[PDB]
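Running co-folding for chloride ion.
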Amino acid sequence: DYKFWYTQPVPKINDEFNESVNEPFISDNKVEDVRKDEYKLPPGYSWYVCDVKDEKDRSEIYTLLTDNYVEDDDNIFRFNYSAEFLLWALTSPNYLKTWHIGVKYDASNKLIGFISAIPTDICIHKRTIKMAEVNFLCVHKTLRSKRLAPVLIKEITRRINLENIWQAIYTAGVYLPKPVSDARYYHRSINVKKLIEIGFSSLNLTMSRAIKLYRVEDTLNIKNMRLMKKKDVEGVHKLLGSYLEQFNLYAVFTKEEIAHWFLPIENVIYTYVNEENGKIKDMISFYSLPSQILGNDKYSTLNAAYSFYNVTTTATFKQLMQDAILLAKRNNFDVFNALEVMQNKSVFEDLKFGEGDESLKYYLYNWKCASFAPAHVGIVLL
Ligand SMILES: C#CCCCCCCCCCCCC(=O)SCCNC(=O)CCNC(=O)[C@H](O)C(C)(C)COP(=O)(O)OP(=O)(O)OC[C@H]1O[C@@H](n2cnc3c(N)ncnc32)[C@H](O)[C@@H]1OP(=O)(O)O
Ligand SMILES: [Cl-]
């Protein structure tokens, strides 16, 4: 039915546009006309201003998401973003505190809903648009299917429009009207035995053969790959910024955004560079996103690395991503996850990735344009 979404400026399920269409559904919007009142909540609920730089507010967000956020289709793993990860994800350059929106139940003073956005410049089919990047929509499990999600979406839309921003980018595992692209997840086992025992992976292929199949030589193809430092920011900016221009959808990073999104933070973000004759010629990056293991008496956490942005000019992309796997292994990750975006799909078979069973759909709000294969996607959202 899509009874909420069809009231919104998004494509209808049957909409199809060719390359000559690349523009808003609704243009000529006016800040002075935006609703100035918060949207009404059901009785006993209230909007809450989450200060993610406040330890208590940030821990309430963490707890809400730890207990209630995204689970896999088989309900065995739930994402477990850390408090430090949330800080990094939500306080990117020029972030707005008004875009970190909580809902509390007054009687218990408990956070039961959350939605967030950060500002980012998005190039879609070579047009660069100031957008809001919406993430972490969460409604407490006990309150599902009470139509709270539309109210959260409408309220953050209002707050984004008050900054004279009228487009948004978001991803979801569920199908909504209507993806601009759709990218399957793929998974490269690192700690084989653990993945088998938690039912992430399967045997048939004995235990010892599986361990041998996925073994990793502890030698880099690019021997001087090293952790990124502050002096590397301009070089990473130039290397990644030039690389991303080939894609139909990417973020246009400023130097300040490069510093924020790529300077290493232990157990949050890992970036490695290859410096040659002064110049950053290759880079590898992946972020940490563990999953809670629901109902396993031996293991409580899956330590997963997620491919972020990877560029090579002195090796093949397979060689580069082989080093990415090694580096994730060296930092104690159990599995290395990646989407079939950018050049990634070309190395999945040779590097012994397995196809997952879920995909990530890319969405734009108030924008109509042609869809495209995920190899043309040049952005990875958290
Ligand atoms: C300009 C500016 C624009 C700014 C706004 C742009 C639009 C942003 C849309 C949201 C983007 C989300 C990005 C993500 O962060 S991804 C992660 C999704 N997080 C989870 O998976 C956590 C686990 N899960 C939950 O916490 C809840 O299930 C949710 C996701 C809150 C859903 O709430 P529940 O209580 O089920 O559903 P209710 O409150 O009755 O609302 C029904 C309507 O809602 C739609 N919907 C459902 N899931 C959605 C979802 N994930 N994103 C958007 N919409 C969603 C759904 O179709 C339906 O509407 P219809 O009637 O079908 O038109
Ligand atoms: Cl080495």
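Result summary
The first helix runs from residue 55 to 68.
The CA atoms of residues 71 and 78 lie 4 Å apart.
Job closed.
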